[PDB]
Symmetry: D2
Subunit: 124 residues, 4 copies
Amino acid sequence: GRDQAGITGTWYNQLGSTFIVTAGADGALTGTYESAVGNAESRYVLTGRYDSAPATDGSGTALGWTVAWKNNYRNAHSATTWSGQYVGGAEARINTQWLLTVGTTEANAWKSTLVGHDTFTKVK
Amino acid sequence: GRDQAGITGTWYNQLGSTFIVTAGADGALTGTYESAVGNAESRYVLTGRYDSAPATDGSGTALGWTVAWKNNYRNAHSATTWSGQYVGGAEARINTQWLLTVGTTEANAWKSTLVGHDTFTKVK
Amino acid sequence: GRDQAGITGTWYNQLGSTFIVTAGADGALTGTYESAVGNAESRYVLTGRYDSAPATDGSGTALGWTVAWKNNYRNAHSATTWSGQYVGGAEARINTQWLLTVGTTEANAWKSTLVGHDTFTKVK
Amino acid sequence: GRDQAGITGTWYNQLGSTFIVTAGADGALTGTYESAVGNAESRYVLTGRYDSAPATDGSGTALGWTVAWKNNYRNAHSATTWSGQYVGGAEARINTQWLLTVGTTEANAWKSTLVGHDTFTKVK
């Protein structure tokens, strides 16, 4: 991975959530997510993928990951996926949009999925 | 996983894409995605997570997964995440929404991310 | 409008909701929305815009509209916007994605917005 | 409208786009949008709706609006809808998510719709 080192480490969103991730040379993302907002608590497992050979034209590095909101302490019966890109440099960022789906009855399916955005930085 | 067997197997979306996945008892999703539409070709690795202890109130099972669109044949410098829920039964379904992010320059970041929806079935 | 007549009329989504709209030659959409699902009841006012000079290359006609979920009978303190395109022909369709935002406290803002999709047809 | 005066006026997003709007007492939004980014130029008409009787529990005021990207100078054959809420006070904000749909062939429909977010302020 060109940005395997850039991505690997700890990231913080604008809400104080904490995203610890290892980027493998094959394109794997693996780590933990600790949410600061919502119906979550400790750490949760995360897995995802990233482009391990990004364009060198100054473009960002596409990636995404999933957290299922079940751990030893909570089950929210829901999952969030983040889709975004890593932008390296002095103020490195991971810019994302996310989809959070809650398990629902078929009658409530139309309102199963929230959408939002998170900006992750290396500081805070 | 309660629906570890329900989820594990091959799924087909309304476009003919093919989603082969193994659901682990710990909540891991792992498999391959073969797209029928877009700037993709063979199989791509996928990883994700699911709720391995869904509510038994008839609600669906939340899950999501990521594909980075890089394999031995293509690099689209992009990643898609699907967020949705598995609904078991005679006409089992995985109902999803997805976010596709393309690596972009900062000037083009505002248009980096497509949104869509996929319905997966066990047939077709 | 090239599809001013194509768009103008009554549309039904996969849920049984009813969308009655007039497309003006200037690009205005105006009408009423009657929801079949959710925390809504009678008709609600809708307004929006459409491309009154679509490409003739077989492409669809971009449009969108908003409903605020307040009428004489209900106030859900929320608004939905549909973004999509009209596809003419024997099986004419309006294919959309929508965002539903609920008024929230700042603490709950991160979960203010649902995302979904609706397909509208001239029949049902 | 409780926030008819709060909403009415000029708003600027983080990109420098300019959103001039009048909120009617019936819940109408009408105005112009002048984009600073993308394939747009001068002003474009906008119309939308807002909740003219928001909850007084400190919650925001739900609203949305549509711009079709056609004016006397440009036709992008596309439309954007913003869905969000107005938050009053010393640092008043309109927090939104948006969907931009481009008219496409049926073969390209799956990639017709971009998603993003805009934060509007009274300054800048």
